[PDB]
């Protein structure tokens, strides 16, 4: 049994989304009491009036908010027998693999949340290899919908292709029967271009999710439902508690075949121009976040209706939809076939809250706890060791406490090619 | 592209590259400082005797004393063709701001860590002092780095002992909570945002873990060609000043005071940028610091590269096997002494039935009585008394205790003397002198010496701040190693005595004796002698 | 209560001084001899017994 | 029961020797005037 120390490297992962995601580290002493939640305001939008005499028509002020929280640690608890040579040999490389897999988990979570809470939906009835320049059509459609909704894009924008569609775009470029700079680069290297159709970062991502086709058919809205932009409401005790601005619960005829991340659109309901409040030509698109009960769902953009009459003027100033729900309108699905998702977002749409685990405290005697920088992603965790003789072993645990948060689900998007059938 | 991720990638590359040397060095430190039983699961077992019979700490102490009895410091000397006293001012400043306790302590700690673990490091910093400034309301001082093997992560692509070809270095600052608030206050940080950074992951002695705070400083050096301005000195000469140092502060104050620009050149020079970093974000981005070199000076013991991988060793790494064996054998023998039945007689109960008070150890009886007859077997069968054989230390244990002690005795002999270690300390001291000279040219006030006096040429700005002006003719003195002196007067006294020890009893002997009297300290008797020697020298011309 | 001077008025003297991992350790001369001295005391007491 | 416990010291003579060795070489402060200061800038402070 001759053996060597040269390791056969087998896998190599790349995590671009977790790099592009901004990381937030709020104070732990306050986060302990605030229940791991912290609230942020939302850019104010104001109403306006016309005319000279406007007595008793003075409005108030209304400033909305969102909440960012965090989940549970992500560990690599494993146990080390002190006599097994095959355990003595692989321990440090197991630590290295732990770091790599923790980073992979982080960026997979980022991708899944971005794909499952992206309100903007750009579908196509045919694949990206079908026509010429249809990859550019996808990227430009994403750019156009962002521009028309007048969303903030000051920090930047990003479009992540899956490898299938990246190769399709490269094929589209090299089939051009000419060779200048773009096709020559797409031939010599696979890269289509760094910027495409106004996006300043077009990348390929090896772990974008595949969005399963929904089984929903013939679902309609039960009752007219008007949603009102509020910053807080009274609870049962009279205490005023805050409201997330990124959710609305809609009561439908039947929520069967609807799951988290499905993309829907209500017939007749149209987008708005946000700031200017001018209707667009494109149906508003929503993403169902949670299917609560068997007749309710929770869609991530709140459908505030411009034509709504029960809204105060400062509340109407937040309308992102031309008309409300009408007790019969048909909610039609948008993902009607299985297809991997290309995902675009403005760089300020997703953040990564992170917290420390103070296991180095004097409370935890016997354990040795040190810090442990996760590479690739910009995160810190703990590395804790505690020996044992109830089994004559030792326990090693690498823990990481973070949480991804989509602060602007309306600035995230999903590109769905081949949405026929 | 991202600054945090580029810095982090460099840091993890270096941290992984130096993984083996750092862990071996940390093991050396723990072995020679805390405990000689490097076991982490032996704290959870049932207890056996574990002795510590040290035979390497005396050798470490002897080496430390030997290398402390021979201080070494920088010594600036004029170049070839330069003025004979071009090192006077620089040497004066160095002796002024390196005489403090912090400098000597930093060097001593680096030396002790060089002897034990094989690597040490200290740092040079600049601060603003209002009461006793060396020059330009500023001081340059020296600080230690504790556990350099784990706290200084040099650039991995360095093939030089002093790390002058390293392009970056990350220094890990560890400090208590209160120290963290002071650090945040001083560097304009958010004291509520508690920082974090990677520190070595271990298993041994969990009681060494302090609830502390880690941060990092990433030093990066960039060599580029920047613009210099060729002026005409209103007093005399054509001095040269860099663009970046007077870009806005005194750029036209120069002209107002009377500097008429002559020519503009591009000169290649190095600049150093410091960044304060945590694991998840960058707190300070690219703060330019003084000097052309990274302010961290490493000291190495037995240093080399085996296969594109660094190895550095002290004097302790090589005796751990013998000393651990000696500890184990001594503990085994102590167990033999304690837990073993002693030499006592073997008795059937019927031999001494009824006589048991004679055999309990009292001396009230003249003899011992044994029973003779058995009711059934007639008589007691005859067989000599057996005794439990006395405990003994096995020949194997004795032989290996002697052999292991001898092995440690042979191995723990640095050199034949500490010449190579002192030479490595001198290498680090020349690097220290070079770094200090660079920082001095960058921040201090260097008065040029003319043969027509010291011409201190500076000018102020509109914000009442004075901007230093130093010509490019600055490297007129090179670095050497000599004895450690507390001031230039002590240095002059030493030079005079060294000359006097060799000059015979002619006229130069009288001359040097009068000079030695002149350069003496002041009381009353030495004042009288100094005045007499002054009069003698003046009257002799 | 403001006191005279700029420095804290306590002067510490150390023997063998250093750090290990953000942990200060100082040592005199009796620390290492304890094991052998205790063994010698125990063995002489055993012999007296 | 109470067993014999002797104290056969071999480290106290060493400690005594080292303390005597340190006592035989007293050390005090010594103020020396700086570079360029008046040559008797430290006699007042030294005397006090």
DSSP string covering B17-38: HTHHHHHHHHHHHHHHHT-S--
- Residue C20 touches partner B, C-beta closer than 8 Å: yes
- Residue D19 touches partner C, C-beta closer than 8 Å: no
Written as six digits, the tokens of B309 are 């991988």
Q: Best of B7, B279, B309 to disrupt the A interface by mutation (most A CBs within 10 Å)?
A: B279
Q: Best of D1, D4, D19 to disrupt the C interface by mutation (most C CBs within 10 Å)?
A: D4
**CB distance D35–B523 less than 8 Å?**
no
Residue of A nearest to B280 (CA): A378
The closest alpha carbon to A303, from A281, A328, A321, A316, belongs to A321
CB atoms near residue B101 (< 10 Å): 7
Q: CB of A285 within 8 A of CB of A119?
A: yes
**CB distance C29–D15 less than 8 Å?**
yes
Contacting residues for C20 by C-beta, under 8 A, at least 6 apart: B29, B30, B33, B34, B147, B208
Q: CB of A196 within 8 A of CB of A138?
A: no
Q: How many CA atoms lie within 13 A of B92 on its CB side?
A: 15
The vertex-B326 CA angle with B324 and B327, nearest 5°, equals: 65
- Residue B174 touches partner A, C-beta closer than 8 Å: no
Per-residue DSSP letter, B387:
B
Q: CB of A400 within 8 A of CB of A381?
A: yes
Per-residue DSSP letter, B90:
H
CA–CA dist B425, B296 (Å, integer)? 14
Q: Which residues of B touch D34 (CB under 8 A)?
A: 96, 487
- Residue B147 touches partner C, C-beta closer than 8 Å: yes
CA–CA dist B393, B415 (Å, integer)? 36
Chain-centroid distance, C-alpha B60: 15
Contacting residues for B223 by C-beta, under 8 A, at least 6 apart: B268, B269, B270
- Give the closest of B96, B521, B527 to D32, CB-based: B521
A and D: touch, per 3+ CB pairs < 8 A?
no
- Residue C7 touches partner B, C-beta closer than 8 Å: no
The Cα of D38 is separated from the nearest Cα of chain B by a number of Å equal to: 9
CA–CA dist B281, A147 (Å, integer)? 31
Contacting residues for B518 by C-beta, under 8 A, at least 6 apart: B530, B533, B534, B537
Kindly tell me the burial class for residue B116, based on how many C-beta atoms sit within 10 Å of its own C-beta (0-12, 13-18, 19 or more): buried
- Give the closest of D4, D6, D15 to C30, CB-based: D15
Resolution in A: 3.1
Residue of B nearest to A366 (CA): B206
- Give the closest of C23, C36, C39 to B208, CB-based: C23
CA–CA dist D2, B474 (Å, integer)? 80
Q: CB of A251 within 8 A of CB of A223?
A: yes
- Residue D32 touches partner B, C-beta closer than 8 Å: yes
Map tokens 């991997």 to a residue.
Answer: A340
The closest alpha carbon to B77, from B490, B424, B425, B475, belongs to B475
What residues pair up with B481 in beta bridges, in sequence order? B74
Q: Which long-range contacts (CB under 8 A, 24 or more apart) does B23-26 make?
A: B23/B200, B24/B313, B24/B317, B25/B117, B25/B118, B25/B119, B25/B149, B25/B150, B25/B312, B25/B314, B26/B117, B26/B147, B26/B149, B26/B150, B26/B200, B26/B202, B26/C21
Per-residue DSSP letter, B208:
G
Q: Best of C29, C31, C32, C34 to disrupt the D interface by mutation (most D CBs within 10 Å)?
A: C29
Distance between first and last Cα of chain A: 58
Map tokens 């499952």 to a residue.
Answer: A116
Chain-centroid distance, C-alpha B231: 44
Q: CB of A263 within 8 A of CB of A137?
A: no
The b-or-e profile of B462-475 (16+ CB within 10 A means b, else e) is: eeeeebbbbbeebe
Map tokens 């209707």 to a residue.
Answer: A279
Q: CB of A399 within 8 A of CB of A196?
A: no
Q: Which residues of D touch B486 (CB under 8 A)?
A: 32
Q: At B327, phi and psi to the nearest 5?
A: -60, -45
Q: CB of A412 within 8 A of CB of B66?
A: no
What residues pair up with B287 in beta bridges, in sequence order? B274
Identify the H or E element spanning B408. helix B395-411
Per-residue DSSP letter, A214:
P
Q: Where are the alpha helices (DSSP H) in B81-176?
A: 88-97, 101-116, 148-151
CB atoms near residue B339 (< 10 Å): 9
Kindly tell me the burial class for residue A294, based on how many C-beta atoms sit within 10 Å of its own C-beta (0-12, 13-18, 19 or more): exposed
Map tokens 């059938």 to a residue.
Answer: A421
CA–CA dist A114, A17 (Å, integer)? 10
| DSSP string for residues in B73-84 | EEEEEE-SSS-T
CA–CA dist B36, B409 (Å, integer)? 17
- Residue D12 touches partner B, C-beta closer than 8 Å: no
CA–CA dist B148, B301 (Å, integer)? 13
Map tokens 């601005």 to a residue.
Answer: A245
Q: CB of B434 within 8 A of CB of B293?
A: yes
Pairing of β B138-145 and β B152-154 = unpaired
Q: CB of A310 within 8 A of CB of A319?
A: no
Contact partners of B by the rule of 3+ C-beta pairs under 8 A?
A: A, C, D
Identify the H or E element spanning B286. strand B282-289
Q: At A110, phi and psi to the nearest 5?
A: -55, -50
- Residue B487 touches partner D, C-beta closer than 8 Å: yes
Q: CB of A283 within 8 A of CB of A353?
A: no
Question: What percent helix, strand, coil does chain A show, rounded to 5?
Answer: 20, 30, 55
CA–CA dist B325, B404 (Å, integer)? 7
Q: CB of B183 within 8 A of CB of B156?
A: no
| DSSP string for residues in B475-515 | --EEEEEE---SSHHHHHHHHHHHHHHHS-SSHHHHHHHHH
Using DSSP, state whether A220 is helix, strand or coil.
Answer: strand
CA–CA dist A370, A356 (Å, integer)? 12
Written as six digits, the tokens of B266 are 């591009």
- Enter the CATH code of domain A211-339+408-416: 2.40.30.240
How many separate helices (H) and strands (E) can be counted in chain B? Answer: 14, 19
Q: CB of B290 within 8 A of CB of B271?
A: no
Q: Best of B97, B487, B489, B528 to disrupt the D interface by mutation (most D CBs within 10 Å)?
A: B489
The vertex-A114 CA angle with A111 and A118, nearest 5°, equals: 150
Written as six digits, the tokens of A55 are 């007595």
Q: At B271, phi and psi to the nearest 5?
A: -135, 150
| Biggest CA-to-CA distance, chain C | 63
**CB distance B487–D39 less than 8 Å?**
no
- Residue C40 touches partner D, C-beta closer than 8 Å: yes
Per-residue DSSP letter, B381:
P
- Residue A23 touches partner B, C-beta closer than 8 Å: yes
- Residue B201 touches partner A, C-beta closer than 8 Å: yes
Q: At B263, phi and psi to the nearest 5?
A: -145, 165
Using DSSP, state whether B186 is helix, strand or coil.
Answer: helix
Using DSSP, state whether B68 is helix, strand or coil.
Answer: helix
Written as six digits, the tokens of B458 are 């500076």
Cα–Cα distances in angstroms (integers) from residue B116 to residues A103, B26, B206, B300, C18, in the given order: 37, 10, 22, 11, 11
CA–CA dist C12, C26 (Å, integer)? 12
The Cα of D4 is separated from the nearest Cα of chain B by a number of Å equal to: 15
Could you tell me the strand order of the sheet in which A412-416 lies?
A120-123, A412-416, A342-346, A157-161, A202-204
Contacting residues for B72 by C-beta, under 8 A, at least 6 apart: B422, B425, B426, B429, B481, B482, B483, B484
**CB distance C49–D10 less than 8 Å?**
no
CB atoms near residue B67 (< 10 Å): 20
Q: CB of A285 within 8 A of CB of A261?
A: no
Contacting residues for B205 by C-beta, under 8 A, at least 6 apart: A368, B30, B34, B35, B40
CA–CA dist A40, A67 (Å, integer)? 6
The closest alpha carbon to B109, from B59, B67, B162, B161, belongs to B67
CB atoms near residue C10 (< 10 Å): 5
Residue of D nearest to C30 (CA): D11
**CB distance D35–B486 less than 8 Å?**
no
Contact partners of D by the rule of 3+ C-beta pairs under 8 A?
A: B, C
Kindly tell me the burial class for residue A102, based on how many C-beta atoms sit within 10 Å of its own C-beta (0-12, 13-18, 19 or more): buried
The number of residues in chain A equals: 421
The closest alpha carbon to A407, from A67, A72, A110, A152, belongs to A67
Cα–Cα distances in angstroms (integers) from residue B309 to residues A251, B16, B159, in the given order: 66, 11, 10
Q: CB of B125 within 8 A of CB of B169?
A: no
Q: Which residues of A touch B279 (CB under 8 A)?
A: 371, 373-374, 378-380
Identify the H or E element spanning A87. helix A85-89
- Residue C37 touches partner B, C-beta closer than 8 Å: no
- Residue B36 touches partner C, C-beta closer than 8 Å: no
Using DSSP, state whether B240 is helix, strand or coil.
Answer: strand
Written as six digits, the tokens of A408 are 């602007």
Q: Best of B492, B522, B527 to disrupt the D interface by mutation (most D CBs within 10 Å)?
A: B522
């Amino acid at each position: 049994t001759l053996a060597v120390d040269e390791i056969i490297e087998t896998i190599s992962a790349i995590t671009p989304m977790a790099q592009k995601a901004k990381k937030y580290t709020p104070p732990a002493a306050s986060m302990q009491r605030s229940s791991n939640t912290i609230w942020m305001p939302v850019e104010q939008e104001s109403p306006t009036q016309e005319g000279w005499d406007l007595t008793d028509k003075a409005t108030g002020l209304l400033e909305l908010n969102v909440a960012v929280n965090m989940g549970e640690p992500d560990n690599d608890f494993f146990q080390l027998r002190a006599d097994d040579l095959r355990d003595e040999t692989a321990y440090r490389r197991r630590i290295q693999s732990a770091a790599r897999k923790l980073a992979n988990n982080v960026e997979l979570k980022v991708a899944n949340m971005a794909a499952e809470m992206g309100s903007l939906v750009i579908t196509s009835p045919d694949a990206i290899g079908t026509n010429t320049a249809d990859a550019w059509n996808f990227v430009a459609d994403a750019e156009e919908i962002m521009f028309s909704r007048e969303l903030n894009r000051d920090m930047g924008t990003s479009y992540f292709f899956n490898p299938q569609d990246y190769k399709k775009a490269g094929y589209d470029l090299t089939k051009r029967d000419i060779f200048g700079r773009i096709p020559e680069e797409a031939y010599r290297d696979g890269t289509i271009q760094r910027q495409v159709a106004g996006f300043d970062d077009v990348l390929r991502s090896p772990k974008l999710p595949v969005l399963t086709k929904s089984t929903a058919t013939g679902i309609t809205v039960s009752g007219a439902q008007s949603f009102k932009p509020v910053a807080w409401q009274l609870d049962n005790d009279g205490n005023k508690v805050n409201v997330d601005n990124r959710f609305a619960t809609v009561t439908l005829s039947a929520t069967t075949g609807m799951k988290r991340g499905d993309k829907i659109s209500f017939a007749g309901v149209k987008f708005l121009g946000q700031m200017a409040k001018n209707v667009l030509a494109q149906d508003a698109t929503f993403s169902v976040v949670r299917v609560v009960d068997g007749t309710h769902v929770e869609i991530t953009p709140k459908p505030v209706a411009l034509d709504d009459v029960s809204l105060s003027p400062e509340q109407r100033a937040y309308a992102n939809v031309n008309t409300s729900l009408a007790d019969a309108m048909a909610v039609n699905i948008l993902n009607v076939k299985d297809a991997r998702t290309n995902v675009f977002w403005a760089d300020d749409a997703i953040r990564i809250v992170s917290q420390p685990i103070p296991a180095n405290h004097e409370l935890f005697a016997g354990m040795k706890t040190t810090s442990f920088s996760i590479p690739d992603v910009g995160l810190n965790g703990i590395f804790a060791t505690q020996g044992d003789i109830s089994t004559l072993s030792g326990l090693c645990r690498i823990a990481l406490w973070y949480g991804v948060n989509a602060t602007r689900p309306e600035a995230i998007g999903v590109g769905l090619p081949g949405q026929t059938a | 592209e991202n600054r945090l991720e580029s810095i982090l990638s460099r840091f993890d590359a270096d941290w992984t590259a130096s993984d083996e040397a750092r862990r071996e060095a940390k093991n050396d430190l723990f072995f020679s400082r805390v405990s000689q039983w490097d076991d982490w699961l032996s704290q959870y077992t049932t207890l056996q005797y574990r002795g510590q019979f040290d035979v390497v700490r005396p050798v470490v102490r002897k080496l430390v004393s030997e290398m402390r009895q021979n201080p070494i410091d920088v010594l600036y000397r004029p170049k070839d063709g330069a003025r004979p006293d071009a090192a006077d001012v620089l040497m004066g400043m160095y002796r002024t701001d390196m005489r403090h306790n912090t400098a000597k302590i930093a060097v001593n700690i680096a030396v002790r860590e060089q002897i034990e673990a094989g690597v040490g490091a200290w740092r040079l910093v600049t601060d603003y002092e209002d009461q006793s400034p060396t020059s330009n309301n500023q001081v340059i001082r020296r600080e230690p780095i504790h556990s350099a093997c784990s706290h200084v992560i040099w650039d991995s692509n360095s093939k030089l002992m002093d790390k002058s070809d390293a392009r970056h270095c990350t220094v890990i600052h560890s400090m208590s909570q209160n120290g963290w608030e002071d650090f945040a206050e001083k560097y304009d940080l958010d004291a509520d945002d508690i920082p974090s950074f990677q520190n070595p992951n271990d298993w041994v002695f969990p009681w060494l873990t302090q609830d502390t705070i880690q941060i990092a400083e990433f030093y990066e050096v960039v060599e580029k060609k920047e613009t210099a301005f060729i002026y005409q000195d209103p007093v005399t000469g054509e001095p040269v000043s860099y663009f970046k140092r007077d870009i806005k502060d005194v750029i036209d104050d120069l002209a107002d005071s009377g500097f008429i620009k002559i020519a503009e050149r591009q000169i290649k020079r190095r600049r150093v940028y410091k960044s304060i970093i945590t694991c998840t974000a960058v707190l300070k981005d690219k703060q330019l610091i003084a000097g052309e070199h990274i302010p961290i000076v490493p000291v190495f013991g037995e240093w080399g590269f085996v296969e594109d991988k660094e190895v550095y060793e002290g004097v302790v790494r090589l005796t751990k096997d013998g000393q651990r064996l000696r500890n184990m054998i001594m503990s085994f023998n102590a167990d033999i002494v304690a837990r073993t039945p002693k030499k006592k007689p073997f008795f059937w109960p019927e031999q001494i039935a009824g006589f048991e008070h004679m055999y309990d150890g009292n001396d009230d009886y003249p003899y011992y009585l044994l029973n003779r007859t058995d009711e059934n077997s007639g008589d007691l069968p005859t067989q000599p008394l057996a005794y439990y054989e006395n405990p003994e230390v096995p020949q194997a244990n004795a032989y290996m205790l002697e052999a292991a002690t001898s092995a440690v005795k042979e191995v723990a002999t640095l050199g034949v003397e500490t010449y190579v270690f002192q030479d490595n300390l001198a290498t680090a001291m020349r690097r220290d002198g070079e770094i200090y000279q660079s920082i001095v040219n960058d921040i201090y006030d260097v008065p040029r010496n003319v043969t027509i006096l010291m011409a201190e040429v500076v000018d102020l700005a509109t914000g009442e701040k004075q901007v230093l002006n130093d010509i490019r003719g600055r490297y007129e003195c090179y670095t050497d190693v000599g004895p450690s002196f507390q001031s230039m007067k002590q240095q002059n006294r030493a030079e005079i005595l060294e000359l006097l020890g060799k000059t015979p009893q002619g006229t130069p002997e009288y001359q040097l004796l009068l000079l030695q009297y002149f350069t003496l300290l002041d009381g009353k008797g030495v004042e009288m002698m100094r005045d007499y020697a002054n009069k003698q020298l003046i009257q002799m011309g």
